[PDB]
Subunit: 101 residues, 4 copies
């Protein structure tokens, strides 16, 4: 019915290419520095779930404030991941295809 | 000159959404959804982040750069980078977070 | 004065000290394997942050100024404590798993 | 009963200092001190944390549980927990941080 279960989907933009072009528009962008920075954000992301066990409600039912924190940490991880991949000259989008075979 | 010249770029596709749907299909087709719970995907991502760090662990800061890494290492790097990306996408989708939008927002 | 770790506390001391700090707070419900594992990943992240701005220059962390060294000690010990807590929750004898690993 | 539970405890040794020495000896024998710079050890630690995370990734916490896993898995667990501790010890030492003392200092507040 009209009140439930629309499928979840991502917006079509920005794309991985757009995201990279945005990062460079914003030294310390050495591979290991970006890798360490990624690890730090992955840690932030993990902090949000550490005490969130089975006995509790999942992320799509978390309070708007909590969800906002989740969107931020997920975002940070992606940003450094794109930056790192770019820096390494790895065609990230393609790498995903050259994988699934 | 007409030599080592290539303004590195990402291909215009797959898009993050293409990657999501792509991975969603691959899973639904194998009945993997049961494993795709948030903490599971989070821990899977951490596992892949560990694999990626392994490629850089003994690599010095003054060295050439991943760009100049032998081909076998460059291939491993491609795989791990994209392994981490796939799980990050799976995790955001499972949490119903529109990743692309959260990044421009960020 | 050659560098060394102090003789104690030991890993067992650490396990004990942590086990009591939490008990005196009724935190046992929070010490489930995956919870502790994720908390540990969280601290490894804090530790990583102290080094992303750096580079392995000859003068290492040993020459880091006071505030930065206090921070490194803190994050390092934060990681160790959750690791100890995780091992205990898993009934893994960490000290022995180590020697038996050589 | 006789087949019921019992208090869990770590062995009295090796100590953290003992572990630092054993690892130092190992890197000495194989000549790895040159690769054991702080950032290398951190990233190596991150790698082992990844190995450890893999053992738990598809396991719920309301499931059998580690103290009940198959011996082969419990063996892998022991190995990965050890790997994380070893690099942690190595990173600390390489940074001249008295790890045990840092714990005490922490507990003081």
């Amino acid at each position: 019915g009209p009140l439930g279960s629309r499928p979840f989907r991502f917006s079509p933009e920005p794309t991985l290419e757009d995201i990279r072009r945005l990062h460079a528009e914003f030294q310390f962008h050495q591979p290991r520095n970006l890798l360490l920075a990624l690890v730090g954000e992955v840690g932030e992301l993990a902090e949000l779930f550490q005490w969130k066990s089975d006995t509790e409600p999942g992320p799509q039912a978390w309070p708007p404030k909590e969800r906002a924190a989740l969107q931020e940490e997920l975002s940070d991880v992606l940003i450094y991941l794109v930056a790192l991949a770019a820096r390494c000259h790895v065609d990230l989008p393609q790498a995903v295809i050259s994988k699934m075979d």
